[PDB]
C-alpha cells in the first residue's frame with residue numbers, strides 16, 4: 203500500500219502495536235559473540251543491545267578492537283551510517299578513535315547527557331574553547347572551535363588532532379536537544395529541519411566516511427533518524443515514489459543492527475516524518 207493512506211488505515215484501526223510486533227518477529231537474528239566476551243562487559247551500556255559480528259566496527263588496535271557500533275550500508279539509496287551507543291566513561295577515547303579511523307565528518311547526537319534524572323551518556327566533548335580534552339589511551343586531542351545554540355538543536359565545530367602524526371581534522375557535531383524525556387515529538391517539523399541541517403553540511407555525502415549517529419542505546423531515536431533519511435532519498439531517486447515501503451526499509455536496516463525502532467510510537471512517528479518530509483522536498 204501507499205504510505206499516507208496505510209497510515210490513516212492503521213490509525214483508524216488502532217493496530218500500531220500489531221504492525222510493530224510483526225516487524226519484531228520478522229527481524230534478522232545474527233550472532234554477536236565478540237560483544238558478549240567477558241573482557242567487553244564494561245564496553246556495553248545495556249546487556250540486551252549488542253552489535254552483530256558481521257557488521258561491527260573494528261578499532262585499529264591489536265589488544266582489543268571492540269566498540270558497540272554497527273555499519274548500516276544502504277545499497278540502493280547509496281548511504282552509509284555508523285550507529286553507536288552513547289559513550290561510557292571508559293569508552294570516550296574509543297569513540298573518537300573510531301571517528302578518526304573511519305574518516306567521518308559529522309557526529310549526530312539525539313539525547314541529552316542527563317534524562318529522567320540519570321546519566322544517558324558521558325560528557326565526551328569540551329564545553330569551553332580554552333579547556334580542551336586529551337584522550338591518553340588513544341592519543342587524540344579534541345578542541346571546541348565554535349558553538350551555535352538554536353531553539354531545537356545546537357551545532358558545534360570541533361578540531362580532532364591525532365597526536366601521533368600531528369594531523370588535524372574538522373568534525374561537525376549536530377545535537378538535537380529537544381526530544382522529550384517520554385514518548386515522541388508531537389510534530390516532526392523540528393526533527394525534519396534538523397535532518398536537513400545535517401544534510402546541508404556535507405556530512406552525509408560520499409566524499410566522507412559514514413556519519414556517526416547515537417542516542418543512549420543507539421537503536422531507537424538513532425533508528426528513526428536513518429530510517430527517515432533513507433526513505434526520503436529513495437522517494438527522490440525512484441520513478442514511482444509511492445513504491446517506497448517503510449517497513450521493508452526498516453527490516454533491511456535491521457539486518458545490520460538489532461532493535462532499530464524501540465516502540466510502536468517511534469514507528470508511527472517515523473511514518474509521520476517521511477510523509478511530511480516528502481511534501482517539503484517538492
Ligand SMILES: CC1CCN(c2ccc(N)cc2Cl)CC1
Nearest residue numbers: 313314315316351353356379380
Ligand atoms: C548536554 C546537555 C546540554 C543541555 N541540553 C539542553 C536542554 C534543553 C534545551 N532547551 C536546550 C539544551 Cl541545549 C541538555 C544536554
